[PDB]
PDB file of N, CA and C in Angstrom:
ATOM      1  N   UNK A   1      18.876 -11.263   7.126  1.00 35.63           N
ATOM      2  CA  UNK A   1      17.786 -11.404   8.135  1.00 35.63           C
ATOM      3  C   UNK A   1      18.132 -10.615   9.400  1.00 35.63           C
ATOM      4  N   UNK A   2      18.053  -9.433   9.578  1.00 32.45           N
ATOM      5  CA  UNK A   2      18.601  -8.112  10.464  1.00 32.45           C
ATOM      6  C   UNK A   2      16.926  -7.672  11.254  1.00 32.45           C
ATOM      7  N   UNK A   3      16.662  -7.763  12.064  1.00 31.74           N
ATOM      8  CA  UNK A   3      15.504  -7.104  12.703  1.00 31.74           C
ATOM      9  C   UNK A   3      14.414  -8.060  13.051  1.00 31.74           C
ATOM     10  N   UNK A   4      13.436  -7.291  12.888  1.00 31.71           N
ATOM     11  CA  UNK A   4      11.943  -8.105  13.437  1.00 31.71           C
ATOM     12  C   UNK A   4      11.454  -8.440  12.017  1.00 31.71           C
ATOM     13  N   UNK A   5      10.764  -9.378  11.687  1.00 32.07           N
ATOM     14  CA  UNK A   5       9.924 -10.106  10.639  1.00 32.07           C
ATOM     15  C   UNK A   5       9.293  -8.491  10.181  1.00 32.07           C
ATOM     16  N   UNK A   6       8.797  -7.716  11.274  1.00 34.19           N
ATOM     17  CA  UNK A   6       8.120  -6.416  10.723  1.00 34.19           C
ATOM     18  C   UNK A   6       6.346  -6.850   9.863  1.00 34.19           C
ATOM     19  N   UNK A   7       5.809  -6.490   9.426  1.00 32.81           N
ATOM     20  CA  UNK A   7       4.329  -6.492   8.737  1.00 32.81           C
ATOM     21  C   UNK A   7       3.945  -5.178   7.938  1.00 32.81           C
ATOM     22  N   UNK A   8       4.265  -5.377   6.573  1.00 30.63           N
ATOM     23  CA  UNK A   8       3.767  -4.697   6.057  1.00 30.63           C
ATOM     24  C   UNK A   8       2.409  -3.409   6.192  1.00 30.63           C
ATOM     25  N   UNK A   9       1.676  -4.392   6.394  1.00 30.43           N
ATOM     26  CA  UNK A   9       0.001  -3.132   7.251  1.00 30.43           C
ATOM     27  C   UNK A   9       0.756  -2.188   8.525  1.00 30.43           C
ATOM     28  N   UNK A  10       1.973  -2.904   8.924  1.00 27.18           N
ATOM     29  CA  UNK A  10       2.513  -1.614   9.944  1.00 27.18           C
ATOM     30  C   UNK A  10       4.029  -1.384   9.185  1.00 27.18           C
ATOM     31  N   UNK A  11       4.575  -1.916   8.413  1.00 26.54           N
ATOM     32  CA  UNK A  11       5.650  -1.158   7.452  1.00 26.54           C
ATOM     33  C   UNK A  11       5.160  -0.028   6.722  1.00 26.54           C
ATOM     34  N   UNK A  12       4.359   0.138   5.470  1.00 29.74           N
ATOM     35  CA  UNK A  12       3.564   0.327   4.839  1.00 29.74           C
ATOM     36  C   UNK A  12       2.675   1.108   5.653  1.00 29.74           C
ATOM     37  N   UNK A  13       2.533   1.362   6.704  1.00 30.39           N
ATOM     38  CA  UNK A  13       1.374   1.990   7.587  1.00 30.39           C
ATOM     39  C   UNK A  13       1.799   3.571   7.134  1.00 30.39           C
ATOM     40  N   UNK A  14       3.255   3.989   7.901  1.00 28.70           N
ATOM     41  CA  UNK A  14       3.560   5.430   7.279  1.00 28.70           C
ATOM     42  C   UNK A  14       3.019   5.955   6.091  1.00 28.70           C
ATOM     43  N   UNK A  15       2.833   4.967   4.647  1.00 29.77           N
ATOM     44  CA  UNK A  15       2.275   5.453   3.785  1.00 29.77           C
ATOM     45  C   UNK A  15       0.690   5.247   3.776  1.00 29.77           C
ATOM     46  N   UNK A  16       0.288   5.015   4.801  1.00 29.75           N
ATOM     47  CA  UNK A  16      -1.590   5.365   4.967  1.00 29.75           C
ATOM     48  C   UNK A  16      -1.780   6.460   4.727  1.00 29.75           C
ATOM     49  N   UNK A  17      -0.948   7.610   5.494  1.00 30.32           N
ATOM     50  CA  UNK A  17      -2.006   9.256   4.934  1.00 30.32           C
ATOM     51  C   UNK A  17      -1.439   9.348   3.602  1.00 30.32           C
ATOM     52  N   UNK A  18      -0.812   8.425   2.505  1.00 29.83           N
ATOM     53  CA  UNK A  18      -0.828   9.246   1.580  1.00 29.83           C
ATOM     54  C   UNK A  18      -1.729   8.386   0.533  1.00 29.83           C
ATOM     55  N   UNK A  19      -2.188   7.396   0.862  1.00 30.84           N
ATOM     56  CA  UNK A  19      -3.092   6.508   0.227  1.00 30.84           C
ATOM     57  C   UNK A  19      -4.789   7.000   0.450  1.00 30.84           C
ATOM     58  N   UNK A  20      -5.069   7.544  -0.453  1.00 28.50           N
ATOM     59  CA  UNK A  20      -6.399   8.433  -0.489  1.00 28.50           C
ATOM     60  C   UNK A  20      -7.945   6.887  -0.350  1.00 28.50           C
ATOM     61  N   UNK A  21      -7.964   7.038  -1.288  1.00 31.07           N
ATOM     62  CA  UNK A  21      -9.179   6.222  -1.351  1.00 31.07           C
ATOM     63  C   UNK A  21      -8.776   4.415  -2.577  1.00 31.07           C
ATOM     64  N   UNK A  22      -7.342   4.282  -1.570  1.00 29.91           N
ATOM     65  CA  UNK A  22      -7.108   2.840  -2.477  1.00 29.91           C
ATOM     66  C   UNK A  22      -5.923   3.358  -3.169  1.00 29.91           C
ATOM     67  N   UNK A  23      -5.352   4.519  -3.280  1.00 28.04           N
ATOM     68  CA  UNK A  23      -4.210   5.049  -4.503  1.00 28.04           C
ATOM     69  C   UNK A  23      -3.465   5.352  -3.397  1.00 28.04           C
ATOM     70  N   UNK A  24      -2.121   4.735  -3.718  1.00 31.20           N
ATOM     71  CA  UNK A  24      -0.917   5.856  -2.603  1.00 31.20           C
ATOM     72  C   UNK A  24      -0.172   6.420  -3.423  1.00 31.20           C
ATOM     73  N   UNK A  25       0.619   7.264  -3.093  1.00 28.56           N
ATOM     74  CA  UNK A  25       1.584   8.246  -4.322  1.00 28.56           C
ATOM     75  C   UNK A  25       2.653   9.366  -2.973  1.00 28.56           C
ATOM     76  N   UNK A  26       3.659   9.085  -3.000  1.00 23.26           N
ATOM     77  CA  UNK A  26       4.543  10.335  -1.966  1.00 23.26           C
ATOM     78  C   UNK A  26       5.677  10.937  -2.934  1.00 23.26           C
ATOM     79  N   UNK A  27       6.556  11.630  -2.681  1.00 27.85           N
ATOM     80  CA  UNK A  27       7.200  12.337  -3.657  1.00 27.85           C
ATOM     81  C   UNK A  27       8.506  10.802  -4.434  1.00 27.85           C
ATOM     82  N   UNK A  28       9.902  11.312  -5.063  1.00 28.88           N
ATOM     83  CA  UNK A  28      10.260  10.301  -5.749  1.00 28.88           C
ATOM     84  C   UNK A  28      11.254  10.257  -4.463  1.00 28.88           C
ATOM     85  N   UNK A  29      11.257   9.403  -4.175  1.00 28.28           N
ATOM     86  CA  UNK A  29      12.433   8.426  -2.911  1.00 28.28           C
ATOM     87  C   UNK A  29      13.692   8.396  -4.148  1.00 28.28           C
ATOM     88  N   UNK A  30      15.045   8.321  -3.406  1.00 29.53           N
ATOM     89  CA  UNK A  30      15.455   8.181  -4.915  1.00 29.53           C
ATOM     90  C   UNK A  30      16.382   6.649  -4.081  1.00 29.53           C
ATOM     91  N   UNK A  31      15.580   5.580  -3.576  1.00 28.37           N
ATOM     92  CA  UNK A  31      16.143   4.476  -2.898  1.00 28.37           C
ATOM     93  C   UNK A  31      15.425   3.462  -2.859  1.00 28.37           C
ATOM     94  N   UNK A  32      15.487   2.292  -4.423  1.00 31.38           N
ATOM     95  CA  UNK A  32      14.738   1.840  -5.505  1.00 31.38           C
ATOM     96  C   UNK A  32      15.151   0.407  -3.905  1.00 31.38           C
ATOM     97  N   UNK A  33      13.833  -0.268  -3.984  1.00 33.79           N
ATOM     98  CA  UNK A  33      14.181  -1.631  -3.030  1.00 33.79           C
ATOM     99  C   UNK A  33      13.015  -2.759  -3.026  1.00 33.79           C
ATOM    100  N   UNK A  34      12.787  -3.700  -2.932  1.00 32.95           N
ATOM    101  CA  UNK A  34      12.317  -4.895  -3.551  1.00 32.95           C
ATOM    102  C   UNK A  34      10.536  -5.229  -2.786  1.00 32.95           C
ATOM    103  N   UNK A  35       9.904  -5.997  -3.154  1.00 34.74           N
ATOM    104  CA  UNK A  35       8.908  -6.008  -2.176  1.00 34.74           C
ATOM    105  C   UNK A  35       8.628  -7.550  -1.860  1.00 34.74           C
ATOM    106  N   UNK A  36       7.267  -7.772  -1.232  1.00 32.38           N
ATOM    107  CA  UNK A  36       6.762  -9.152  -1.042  1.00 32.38           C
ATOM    108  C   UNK A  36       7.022  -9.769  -2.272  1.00 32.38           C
ATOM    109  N   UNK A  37       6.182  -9.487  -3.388  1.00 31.34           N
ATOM    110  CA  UNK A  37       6.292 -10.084  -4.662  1.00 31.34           C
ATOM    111  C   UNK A  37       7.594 -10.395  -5.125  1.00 31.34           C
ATOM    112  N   UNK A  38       8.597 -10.169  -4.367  1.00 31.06           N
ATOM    113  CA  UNK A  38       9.990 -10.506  -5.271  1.00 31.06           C
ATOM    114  C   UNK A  38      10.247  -9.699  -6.147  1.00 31.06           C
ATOM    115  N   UNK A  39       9.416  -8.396  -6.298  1.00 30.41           N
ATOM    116  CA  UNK A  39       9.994  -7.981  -7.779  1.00 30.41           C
ATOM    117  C   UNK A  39      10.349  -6.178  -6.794  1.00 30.41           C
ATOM    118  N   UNK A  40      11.187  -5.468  -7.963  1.00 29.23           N
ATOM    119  CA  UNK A  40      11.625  -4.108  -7.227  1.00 29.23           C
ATOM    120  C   UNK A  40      10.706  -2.509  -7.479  1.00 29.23           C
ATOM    121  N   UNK A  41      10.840  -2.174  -6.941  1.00 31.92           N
ATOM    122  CA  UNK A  41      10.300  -0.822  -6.992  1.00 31.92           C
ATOM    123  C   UNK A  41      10.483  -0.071  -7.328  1.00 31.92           C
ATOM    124  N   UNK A  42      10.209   0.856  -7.923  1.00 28.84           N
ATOM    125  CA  UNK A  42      10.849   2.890  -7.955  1.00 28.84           C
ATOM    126  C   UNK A  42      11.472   3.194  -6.347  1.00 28.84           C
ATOM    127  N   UNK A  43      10.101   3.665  -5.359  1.00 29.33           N
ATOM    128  CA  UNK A  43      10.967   3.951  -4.352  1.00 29.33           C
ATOM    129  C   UNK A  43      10.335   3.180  -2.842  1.00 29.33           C
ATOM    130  N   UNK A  44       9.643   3.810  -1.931  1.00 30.72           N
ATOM    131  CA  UNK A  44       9.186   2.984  -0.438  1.00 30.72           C
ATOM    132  C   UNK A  44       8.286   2.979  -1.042  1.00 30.72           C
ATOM    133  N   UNK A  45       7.603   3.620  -1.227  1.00 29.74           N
ATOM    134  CA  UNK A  45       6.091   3.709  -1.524  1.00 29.74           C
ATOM    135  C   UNK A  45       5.587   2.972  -2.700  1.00 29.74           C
ATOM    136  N   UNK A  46       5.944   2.750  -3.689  1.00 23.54           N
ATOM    137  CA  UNK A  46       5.732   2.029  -5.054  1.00 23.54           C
ATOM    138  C   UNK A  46       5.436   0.434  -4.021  1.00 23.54           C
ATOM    139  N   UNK A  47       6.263   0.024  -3.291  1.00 24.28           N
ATOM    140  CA  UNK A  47       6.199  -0.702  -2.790  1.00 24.28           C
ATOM    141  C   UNK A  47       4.943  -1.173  -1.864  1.00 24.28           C
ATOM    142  N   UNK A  48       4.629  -0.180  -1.486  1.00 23.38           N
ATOM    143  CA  UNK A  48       3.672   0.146  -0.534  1.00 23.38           C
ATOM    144  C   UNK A  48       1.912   0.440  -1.256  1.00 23.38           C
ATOM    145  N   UNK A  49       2.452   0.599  -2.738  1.00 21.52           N
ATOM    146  CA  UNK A  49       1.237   0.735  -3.261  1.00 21.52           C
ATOM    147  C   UNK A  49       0.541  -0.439  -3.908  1.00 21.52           C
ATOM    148  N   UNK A  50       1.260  -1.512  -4.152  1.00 19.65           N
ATOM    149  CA  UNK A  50       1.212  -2.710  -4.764  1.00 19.65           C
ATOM    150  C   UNK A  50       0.261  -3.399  -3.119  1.00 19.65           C
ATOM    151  N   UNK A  51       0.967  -3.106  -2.158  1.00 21.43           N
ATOM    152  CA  UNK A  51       0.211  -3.828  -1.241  1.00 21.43           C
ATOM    153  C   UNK A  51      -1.038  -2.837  -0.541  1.00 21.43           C
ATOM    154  N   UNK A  52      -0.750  -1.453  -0.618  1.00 20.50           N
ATOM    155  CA  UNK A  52      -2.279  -1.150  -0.829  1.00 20.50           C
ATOM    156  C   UNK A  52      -3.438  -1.213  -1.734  1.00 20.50           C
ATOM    157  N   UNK A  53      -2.781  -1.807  -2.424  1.00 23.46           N
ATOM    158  CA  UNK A  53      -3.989  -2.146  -3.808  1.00 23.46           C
ATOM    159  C   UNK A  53      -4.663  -3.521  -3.410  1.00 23.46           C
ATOM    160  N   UNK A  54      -3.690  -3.952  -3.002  1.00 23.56           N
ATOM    161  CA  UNK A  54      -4.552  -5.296  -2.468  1.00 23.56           C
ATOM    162  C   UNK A  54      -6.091  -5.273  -1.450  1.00 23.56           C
ATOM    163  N   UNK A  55      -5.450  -3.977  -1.037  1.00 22.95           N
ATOM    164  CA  UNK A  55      -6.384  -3.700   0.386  1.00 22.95           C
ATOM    165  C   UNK A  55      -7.755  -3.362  -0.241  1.00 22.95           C
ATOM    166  N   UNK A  56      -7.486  -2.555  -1.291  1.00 21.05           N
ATOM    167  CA  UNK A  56      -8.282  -1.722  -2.109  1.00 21.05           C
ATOM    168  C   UNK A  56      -9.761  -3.091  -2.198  1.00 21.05           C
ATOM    169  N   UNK A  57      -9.248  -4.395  -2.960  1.00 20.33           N
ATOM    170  CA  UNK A  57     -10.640  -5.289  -3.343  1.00 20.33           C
ATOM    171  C   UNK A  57     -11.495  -5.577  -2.101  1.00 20.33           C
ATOM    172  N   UNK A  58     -10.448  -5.745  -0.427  1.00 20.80           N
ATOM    173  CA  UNK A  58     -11.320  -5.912   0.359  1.00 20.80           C
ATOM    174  C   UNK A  58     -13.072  -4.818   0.505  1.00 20.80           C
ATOM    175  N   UNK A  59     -12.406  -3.560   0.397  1.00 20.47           N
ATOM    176  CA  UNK A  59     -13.125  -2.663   0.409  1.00 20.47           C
ATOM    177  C   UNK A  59     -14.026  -3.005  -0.719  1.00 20.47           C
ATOM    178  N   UNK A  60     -14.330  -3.740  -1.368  1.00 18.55           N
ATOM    179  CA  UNK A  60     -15.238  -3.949  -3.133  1.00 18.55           C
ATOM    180  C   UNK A  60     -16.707  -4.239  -2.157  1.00 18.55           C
ATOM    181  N   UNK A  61     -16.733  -4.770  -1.185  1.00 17.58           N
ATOM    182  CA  UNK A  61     -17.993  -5.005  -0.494  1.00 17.58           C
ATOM    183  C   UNK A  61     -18.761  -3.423  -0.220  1.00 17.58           C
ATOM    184  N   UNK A  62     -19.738  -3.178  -0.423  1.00 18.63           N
ATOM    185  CA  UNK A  62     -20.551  -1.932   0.039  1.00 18.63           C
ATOM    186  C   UNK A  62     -21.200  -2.318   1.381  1.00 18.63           C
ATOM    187  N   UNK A  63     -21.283  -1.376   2.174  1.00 23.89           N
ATOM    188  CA  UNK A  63     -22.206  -1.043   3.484  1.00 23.89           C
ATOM    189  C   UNK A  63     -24.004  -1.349   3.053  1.00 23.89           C
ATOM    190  N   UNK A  64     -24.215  -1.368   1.470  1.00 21.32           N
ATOM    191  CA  UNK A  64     -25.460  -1.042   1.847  1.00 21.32           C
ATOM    192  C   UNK A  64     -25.703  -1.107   0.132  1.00 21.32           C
ATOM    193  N   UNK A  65     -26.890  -0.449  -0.519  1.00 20.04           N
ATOM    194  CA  UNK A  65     -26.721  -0.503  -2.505  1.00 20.04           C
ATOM    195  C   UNK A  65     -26.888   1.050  -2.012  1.00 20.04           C
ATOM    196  N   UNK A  66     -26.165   1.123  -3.421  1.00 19.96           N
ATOM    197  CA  UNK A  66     -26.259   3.056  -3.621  1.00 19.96           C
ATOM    198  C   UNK A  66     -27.596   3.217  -4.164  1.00 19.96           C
ATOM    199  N   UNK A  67     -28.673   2.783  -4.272  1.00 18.37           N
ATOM    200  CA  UNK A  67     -29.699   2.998  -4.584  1.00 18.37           C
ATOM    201  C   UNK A  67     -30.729   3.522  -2.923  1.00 18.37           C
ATOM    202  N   UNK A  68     -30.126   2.718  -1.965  1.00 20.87           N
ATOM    203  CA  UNK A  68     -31.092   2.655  -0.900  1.00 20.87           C
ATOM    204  C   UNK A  68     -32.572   3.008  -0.670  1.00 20.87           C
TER     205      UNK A  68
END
């Protein structure tokens, strides 16, 4: 227990520009490390994509019908 509690949405934030539309992907980290879920990763970002996916269903709501 070394630092600040920290928050993912601002841990995980660095990997926003590489998270397009709900998908994140950055090159291979080669520094495999664990996440919320308890379980481990490939590299930062694997990590980071599990909890941008989450983000992903908020977005399931539309602005409007694509029919308009």
């Amino acid at each position: 227990e070394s630092g600040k509690a920290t928050s993912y949405a601002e841990l995980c934030n660095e990997y926003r520009k590489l998270v397009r539309n709900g998908k994140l992907a950055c090159t291979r980290e080669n520094d495999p490390i664990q996440g919320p879920d308890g379980k481990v990763h490939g590299n930062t970002c694997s990590m980071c994509e599990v909890f941008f996916q989450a983000e992903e269903e908020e977005k399931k709501k539309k602005e409007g019908e694509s029919r308009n």
